Amino acid sequence: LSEQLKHCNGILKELLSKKHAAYAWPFYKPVDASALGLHDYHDIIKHPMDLSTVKRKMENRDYRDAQEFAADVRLMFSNCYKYNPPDHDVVAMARKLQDVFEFRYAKMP
Ligand SMILES: CC(=O)Nc1cccc(-c2ccc3c(c2)[C@H](NC(=O)OC(C)C)C[C@H](C)N3C(C)=O)c1
Questions:
Q1: Which of 23, 73, 83, 106 reaches 20 to 30 Å from 90, CA-CA?
Q2: Whose CA is nearest to atom 19 of ligand 1?
Q3: 8 in Cβ contact with 102 (< 8 Å)
Q4: Domain range holding 90?
Q5: Number of Cβ within a 10 Å radius of residue 52
Q6: Tally of structural domains, the chain
Q7: Which H or E run contains 11?
């Protein structure tokens, strides 16, 4: 639906908003494997995702439907939980940001 995609665009705006920045910030941009010294990141995560890539896709009208947008947002969180140890700080942040997402996605018309 154009209405579902519009609902998604709203969710995206909310994910990027400054009020979530204390836990959204690790997800704003792509994981820089070099800069973080993570030599195995790209071996383990075959399909990186981040919110700036989601934003670009949205702006370019690449999502044909809401399901595609959700897939990308969940992919971002799934990569986080797959790559990192379960007691990593970034995992708790992921879960907090995912809750912001999933609540709003469940209310899509
Ligand atoms: C916008 C901006 O400059 N952004 C930025 C800056 C520095 C690091 C990261 C950044 C990016 C991604 C991630 C991490 C950091 C995590 N390491 C870490 O200190 O995280 C918490 C303890 C905070 C590692 C992990 C690979 N990760 C994710 C999301 O799976 C992002």
A1: 106
A2: 90
A3: no
A4: 1-109
A5: 13
A6: 1
A7: helix 2-15
